[PDB]
Every structure is written in structure tokens, then in C-alpha cells.
């Protein structure tokens, strides 16, 4: 079944985009931009990455719930696609 296959493919893409967003944001937030003391990241960065991915996954769940309440979709937001 091709249709269920690429339905699972776009679902995995929706997982992958969220995962890359979590990874880039928790990279930016509390890995220090100045300097690195060592490889094999320390205790503080481990704890901050755990708390960042917890806060970030809960925030992604909350916003993905809220934009369905406010009706945000491709038809309601992407007005510029109606020209084509």
C-alpha cells in the first residue's frame, strides 16, 4: 500500500522536523557559545539538556494542541498558495 506508506512517511517527517527543532533549540539555549572545557559534556550541560528537552517537548505538545483550537492550518494561513 503506497498511500499508507507515504502517510507514515509524512508522519515520520513531522516527527523529524520536531526532533530537529528540539535539537537545534536545546543546542542554542544551554551549550555555552564562548568556550568548551572538555569533550564528553559535563554534569550541568547534561542536566540542562534533560530539562530543555522536557520543557521543549511539553511546549511543542501545548502549541500543537493550541493551533488546532485556533484553527491554524495550511488553508487558513498560507493565503499565498491560493494563487496557484
Amino acid at each position: 500500500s503506497q498511500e499508507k506508506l507515504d502517510v507514515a512517511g509524512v508522519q515520520f517527517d513531522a516527527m523529524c522536523s520536531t526532533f530537529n527543532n528540539i535539537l537545534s533549540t536545546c543546542l542554542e539555549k544551554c551549550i555555552p557559545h564562548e568556550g568548551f572545557g572538555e569533550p564528553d559534556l559535563t554534569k550541568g550541560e547534561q542536566c540542562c539538556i534533560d530539562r530543555c528537552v522536557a520543557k521543549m517537548h511539553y511546549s511543542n505538545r501545548l502549541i500543537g494542541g493550541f493551533v488546532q483550537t485556533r484553527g491554524f492550518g495550511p488553508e487558513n494561513q498560507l493565503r499565498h498558495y491560493s494563487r496557484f
Partner: protein
Amino acid sequence: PEEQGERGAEMIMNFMTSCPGKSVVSGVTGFALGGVLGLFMASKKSYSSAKNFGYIGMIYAGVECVIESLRAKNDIYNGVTAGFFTGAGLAYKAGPQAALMGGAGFAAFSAAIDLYMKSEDGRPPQNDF
């Protein structure tokens, strides 16, 4: 058959890393280093020196690893409180002002040590002049 083995490997990683291990490995390290320095101290004395240096190492690494599991950071203002509470908890048995001065001196010593070990990985500058 392997579930308890992999859980034991994960538990020994957690016990060697996530601050219980941090507290006791530096404690026995300070104990062995105090037993080494007791050869120069006696030249019960070596036992008291080993107890003192094991206390110093254990409470410094424990307060550091519990401040750093807090605060979500990996910067300075860590050692200037870890050594402060180390000096307080060590020279606590005699005098409040003496505990304050001992904590302040140990905080300045830990800050100097962290500024020596830290001002080499700070940032590659715009010029090596």
C-alpha cells in the same frame, strides 16, 4: 538473561557519574592524598590529615556536583560558593567569623585554581599577539 546485566551496567554508569560517584571518588582520592601527605606531616597524625583532606575533597566535589546539577550552567560563581561552603563546613567547629574567613579564603583559592585551569579554554581570540 541480559536485562539484569544491562540494567546493572546502566546503574553503575549512573552511580559513577550522577553525583553519588562524584562525592565518594574524590573523597577516597583526598583520603589517599592525605595519607601520602601524612608522611611529610609525621616527619594519628597521618590519620587526621587523611581525614581532613578526604573531607575537603568529598565536600568540595559533592557541593560542586550538586550546584552544577542545579543552576543549568557550567560557569564560574560555582567554585566561589563550593569552596565557600567547603571552608565553612570544615572550619565550622570554631568561630562564626573564623568559619567566614576560612570559607572566603578557600573560595578565593578555588577561584584562583579555576581561573588557572579555565583561562586556557575560554575563547581563541581574534589575534595571537
